[PDB]
Write a protein that binds this ligand. Structure first.
Ligand SMILES: Nc1ncnc2c1ncn2[C@@H]1O[C@H](CSCC[C@H](N)C(=O)O)[C@@H](O)[C@H]1O
Length: 400
């Protein structure tokens, strides 16, 4: 029943002055608020720790993504200068594997610089410690936003995608980035015969279980109207959908960058090839808990709607398209992960470590693990056929 947290008073205050906030604003606050945000504040004080993600399972993952970067660079026409952008790099482990594994491709390696987009100073710090070669001391950690890898590759940190240079061919990597973006939640009302938005308000009822509560907008909000052409037209009463508008905006930026200067994006996450009705989850101490249970104290994740991403891109009607999704297992095998598995494994010649390597491979590709839950979609030029998407479906209805 009790008691009220510092963050729940700040969030209850927003609702008093501005009225009930969106799920989007709510998640934006819980994750990215200074000083209460789940990222930046707490669960770090070092290299995170709780980062159990695909790159952290196996160098195999990073190496396959690296082969993809090189193969895609080849299909683009071996541009002399190439940007590699990672959205939400985490510890930097994925990027570290890529830069380690792609060094042998001399021509490729000489054309690349890296741009990491990252909002958390703590994750920024971990990424830099890792990845960077420090030649002299007396580095000012935040003011100097650029550094150099031990192999001389240039890495620049930025807070938003918008700050990355434009008019240079660019690869974009987003791995467990989209599931941490804010979403809006919409619900159909027969009474209004229109969509309403689920909002977060005060809870000052008698038996108010958590201080905050899920309310519903009266009329259709700005956001409902803005996205109405992506919401199902057919609506039973109370029918409810999540939409990651933050991610759609990012998808549009990427699609347009590719349209202007060329490139390709690789978006990897757990999600569905359909609109997602309900997925927003809050985990804490290895248990699922209520989204409104001490907000800030639990990690909020979403399952990614790959379908709306794809449509949203295509709806720009320029040189970019979106191909996918395909299952992570199918993608990784199609990139040659089993060849690398046996190449790396042959070198280990320690049998207990070999089993370690295989188990991480199984986690990545086996359907009962990450193999099917995780999926891959690409944003790219219509003219340049992507690498690793031979199993992608053709969506004849959406292609006009
Ligand atoms: N709105 C936003 N803009 C930029 N970075 C963000 C963001 N929201 C979250 N992030 C960052 O994205 C990452 C999400 S966690 C995923 C980390 C890494 N990809 C891995 O596989 O382990 C974190 O580094 C977090 O700080």
């Amino acid at each position: 029943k009790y008691p009220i947290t510092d963050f729940e008073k700040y969030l209850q205050d927003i609702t008093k002055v501005r009225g009930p906030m969106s799920i989007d604003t709510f998640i934006k606050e819980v994750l990215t608020n200074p000083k209460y945000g789940y990222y930046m504040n707490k669960d770090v004080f070092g290299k995170g720790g709780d980062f159990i993600t695909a790159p952290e399972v196996s160098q195999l993952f990073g190496e396959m993504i690296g082969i993809w970067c090189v193969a895609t660079w080849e299909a683009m026409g071996k541009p002399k200068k190439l940007q590699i952008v990672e959205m939400g790099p985490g510890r930097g482990t994925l990027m570290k594997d890529i830069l380690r594994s792609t060094k042998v491709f001399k021509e490729f390696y000489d054309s690349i610089s890296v741009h990491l987009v990252e909002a958390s100073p703590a994750n920024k710090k971990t990424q830099k410690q890792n990845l960077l070669y420090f030649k002299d001391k007396a580095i000012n950690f935040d003011h100097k936003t650029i550094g150099e890898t031990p192999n001389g590759i240039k890495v620049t940190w930025v807070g938003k995608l918008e700050e990355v240079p434009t008019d240079i061919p660019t690869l974009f990597l987003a791995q467990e980035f989209f599931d941490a973006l804010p979403i809006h939640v919409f619900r159909f009302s027969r009474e209004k015969n229109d969509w309403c938005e689920v909002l977060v308000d005060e809870d000052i009822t008698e038996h108010g279980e958590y201080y905050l509560r899920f309310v519903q907008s009266k009329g259709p909000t700005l956001m409902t109207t803005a996205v109405k052409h992506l919401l199902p037209e057919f609506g039973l009463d109370g029918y409810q959908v999540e939409l990651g508008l933050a991610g759609l905006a990012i998808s549009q930026q990427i699609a347009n960058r590719i349209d202007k200067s060329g490139g390709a994006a690789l978006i990897i996450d757990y999600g569905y090839d359909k609109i997602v009705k309900s997925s927003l989850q809050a985990i804490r101490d290895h248990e699922f808990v209520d989204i409104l249970d001490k907000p800030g104290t639990a990690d909020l994740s979403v399952w990614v709607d790959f379908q709306t991403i794809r449509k949203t891109v295509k709806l720009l009607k320029n040189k970019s398209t979106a191909i996918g999704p395909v299952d992570q297992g199918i993608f990784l095998k199609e990139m040659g992960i089993e060849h690398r598995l046996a190449q790396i494994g042959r070198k280990l010649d320690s049998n207990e470590k070999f089993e370690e390597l295989v188990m991480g491979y199984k986690k990545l590709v086996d359907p009962k693990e990450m193999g099917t839950n995780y999926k891959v979609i690409t944003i790219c030029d219509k003219n340049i056929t992507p690498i690793g998407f031979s199993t992608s479906k053709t969506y004849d209805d959406e292609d006009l």
